[PDB]
Amino acid sequence: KKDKEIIAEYDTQVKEIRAQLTEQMKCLDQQCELRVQLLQDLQDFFRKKAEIEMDYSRNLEKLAERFLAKTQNVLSPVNCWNLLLNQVKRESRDHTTLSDIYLNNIIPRFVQVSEDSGRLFKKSKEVGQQLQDDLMKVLNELYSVMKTYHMYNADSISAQSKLKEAEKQEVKKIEKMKEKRQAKYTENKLKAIKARNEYLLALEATNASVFKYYIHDLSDLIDQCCDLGYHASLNRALRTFLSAELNLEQSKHEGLDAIENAVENLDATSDKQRLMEMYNNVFCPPMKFEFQPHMGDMASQLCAQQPVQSELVQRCQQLQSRLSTLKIENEEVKKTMEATLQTIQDIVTVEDFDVSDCFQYKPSIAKRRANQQETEQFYFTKMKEYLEGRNLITKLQAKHDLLQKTLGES
Amino acid sequence: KKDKEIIAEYDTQVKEIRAQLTEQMKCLDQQCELRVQLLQDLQDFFRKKAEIEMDYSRNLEKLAERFLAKTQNVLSPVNCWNLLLNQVKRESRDHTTLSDIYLNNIIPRFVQVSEDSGRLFKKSKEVGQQLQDDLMKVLNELYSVMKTYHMYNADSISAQSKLKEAEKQEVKKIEKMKEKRQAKYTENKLKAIKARNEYLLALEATNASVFKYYIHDLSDLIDQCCDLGYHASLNRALRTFLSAELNLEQSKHEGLDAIENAVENLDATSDKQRLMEMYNNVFCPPMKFEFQPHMGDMASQLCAQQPVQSELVQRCQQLQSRLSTLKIENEEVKKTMEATLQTIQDIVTVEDFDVSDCFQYKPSIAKRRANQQETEQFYFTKMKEYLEGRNLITKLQAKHDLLQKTLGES
């Protein structure tokens, strides 16, 4: 194994590490450029998004303002409508708020983490550079130390060969010449030892220097970015996003809950009561018509004297025969009416409102609607009958009862 | 109390009711126009809103698509970014869905309830009309019945006055003339009774007819709108709104939860590990430098023979004096470093993310940021010191330890 061959193997191992150290600097540089591109993207994204939310908000504000400008007791369906407009006005405010946060809060942070990543990469490239220059020293320091040993070993091999002949040539003066060869060898074999020890100690230093870079110093260099507050500053910026999103959610929920309440109080009878107590001079029953005596009449009740008692009994009895027969027919019409009205209520209260299938990634309607229209049509027929019937029954029952009180039965 | 005076009081009471009945028809007509105006508003509102959501959705779709088009192991911060783009793409889909529902579902219902309200008001005006015509009959029927009584009472007063004189004039034929006056009075006082009884019975009918309108028929007429499915059809339409809003809420929540997860796994060390195991040919430690024997050298360890043992002990002892003093200085620099790094971490992990005050209806930042920059600056000074120190300690400890193993101590 030759001098120049030993030195070439080591030259290669050193060119390998010199190569590798450059790659690590490229890779560390590429990773910074990725960090900086991402904070640029995050800026662009939140800038656009601010704009998007602001437009949305403005359309919403005009949508409410258009219907609020189209303007005592409030009827249930108007109250839903009012709260449906307040919900819109409120979502508008919220999305403006989300715009102010993207612009005055979230983006400033991305700008800052950008400037910092740049600054702190210069400071890290400097540390990277220092650490690589110091590994390059130690590696090049070994070349010379190897040479010195290689040299003082060539001397200690050459002087032990010439001493092989300084004894083989052994009349008195030849001994004087060969004892200076032993004074040269015991000088040169010491030189070899002293140089070999410096090399064994040089290897110890080289290997230790290499290992602390590769195992410890590299690793600490790579984390240096995220360790100084990259991840932690991201984390705050994103949670500001999530914060803002959660408050919108909550604000929206409070709004829609006021709508659900008002829908649940959709109530016809309360609305009726409120209609009547608004306009009382319109729905208030009049004073009943009183008997109005002519020429100062003395009596003012039914007179069932003679011979009229027999006619009044005839009348009363004939009213009662009709009343009994008419009421039974009327109650039959009333039954149909109510059963028909019921059928309508079952069509109009179908639970068809839940639309969750639509977020999940028939023409027979017209046939049913014709049937509905025909049912309503028939309902009103029977109502008009019912009412025509009830109106006679009302006057006959009235007359009959005045007679019955007056005459009796048996 | 006169004939024409009794008839005028009743005429008035009847003009009062005739008036009132007209008002009720106006009020019922006005209420329909309000129903129809509201379903027009609700149509206009949900038509516009569909448009608004569709625009918003389109801006959102392009916002994501712009960054997804800007495109092995994914580093924590990119993963947040990817999920932040998916959240946007998903809100876009959802708002399109909400547009389809407003247009293909909610508005069709309002259109239908509109057509129905119109149809069923014609049918109700007809019932209103019937009921008012029948109350008008009964009221006018009483005029004549009052007159008939008023008449046959004028006859029964006049024939009882002329019988006062038919007895006061009472020689034989005058009795024959006055007994036909008693035959006229007992005919006319019967006529009065028969007419008065028809009037007392007419009042009974009138009052009963009036009361069933005012108390029962009016009330049932006013509800007739909301009873046939107005409120119930509103209710379904609004709950379709609330349904759709709840699924958006839910879909959005699932999205933002994937962001919160990815923010919570922002992790520098995992990212480091993933960086290194991507590019292993770059971070892998090299083969340690071996002792390379020259000319086939026999020994290959430290030679601590004579006289070199005394020099090697001198060296070892002097390395150890420096090592002890340098390490203690280095550990001091290390301490400052770490305490300075800690200070940085406390600045970068301030919990400032919660923005709820902003949905609720300082310039000293630059001073703190200068202080941060100066701390980072000082951190890196001490690091460069620390490292310069550690690099000598590494080679001295290496050499020393090879000596110590070889020689001993005592």
Swiss-Prot record, chains A, B:
Homodimer. Heterodimer; forms a heterodimer with SRGAP2C, altering SRGAP2 function. Forms a heterooligomer with SRGAP1 and SRGAP3 through its F-BAR domain. Interacts (via SH3 domain) with GPHN. Interacts (via SH3 domain) with FMNL1 (activated by RAC1); regulates the actin filament severing activity of FMNL1 and actin dynamics. Interacts (via SH3 domain) with FMNL3. Interacts with RAC1; specifically stimulates RAC1 GTPase activity. Interacts (via F-BAR domain) with HOMER1. Interacts with ROBO1 and ROBO2. Interacts with FASLG. Interacts with PRMT5. Residues 15-271 form the F-BAR domain. It comes from Homo sapiens (Human). Changing residue 90 to W: Decreased protein stability. It is found in: Cell membrane; Cell projection, Dendritic spine; Postsynaptic density; Postsynaptic cell membrane. Residues 308-347 form a coiled coil. This is SLIT-ROBO Rho GTPase-activating protein 2. It is linked to A chromosomal aberration disrupting SRGAP2 has been found in a patient with early infantile epileptic encephalopathy. Balanced translocation t(1;9)(q32;q13). The F-BAR domain mediates oligomerization, binds membranes, and induces plasma membrane protrusions. There are 3 duplications of SRGAP2 in the human genome as a result of segmental gene duplications. SRGAP2C is the only one to be fixed at a diploid state in the human genome. Moreover, SRGAP2C is functional, interacts with and inhibits SRGAP2 and is human-specific. The appearance of SRGAP2C in the human genome is estimated to 2,4 million years ago, which corresponds to the beginning of neocortex expansion in human evolution and it may have played an important role in this process through its interaction with SRGAP2 function. Postsynaptic RAC1 GTPase activating protein (GAP) that plays a key role in neuronal morphogenesis and migration mainly during development of the cerebral cortex. Regulates excitatory and inhibitory synapse maturation and density in cortical pyramidal neurons. The lineage of its organism: Eukaryota, Metazoa, Chordata, Craniata, Vertebrata.
